[PDB]
Chains A and B, each alone.
Chain A
Amino acid sequence: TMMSGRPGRVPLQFLPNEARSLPPPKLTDPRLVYMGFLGYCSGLIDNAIRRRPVVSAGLHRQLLYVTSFVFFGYYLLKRQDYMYALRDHDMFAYVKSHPEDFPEKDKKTYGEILEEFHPVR
């Protein structure tokens, strides 16, 4: 709908070249840590379903789970940030290019505005 068609957009890129001008998410980002937690939970559920010692059965496969989730999460976060940056860029440009639709109103002080008073009793 709203973002589906935009000028100069490569169809299946998933990460345009203009996204590299944004700060990458830190490796200690809390969302990445949550993705790693999801990987750990997947590994534990894998151990429990297959009737293996849940905490200690397979360490290599649990590590693979955690790193796979973190790896996908990093690029997911990059794309998320890029799309939000595009949204803000477009909104600001549209506000700037249409001044008559977003006019700066007169600043009034609370000493001048008359608000009706509703007593509590």
Chain B
Amino acid sequence: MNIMLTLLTNVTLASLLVLIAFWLPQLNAYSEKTSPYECGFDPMGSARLPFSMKFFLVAITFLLFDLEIALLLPLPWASQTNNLKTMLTMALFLLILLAASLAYEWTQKGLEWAE
């Protein structure tokens, strides 16, 4: 309830700021002023053309490493279990495999960007 009111207040304040910024000043837009910005001249191609991604392999690994966070965040609560020896074995197992996966991608030159 209060978080909804807070979010609404923040979004409304930002929107009113945009509205003020767009309706208070004197607008004079003509074709040359709104043209795309290159440093001095006109662009050759488009900004919508494909832009090659040299770290594409690290990005996919980020998805798999991100989900290893969902497995480790309940660890503060798991420390309150009675049988700590099986919990600590499983928590360390979950991090050794995460370390071994990082080591594997490192040694196979997976962490290097495409040249």
Direct touch of chains A and B (CB < 8 A): no
Which A residues contact B (CB, under 8 angstroms)? none
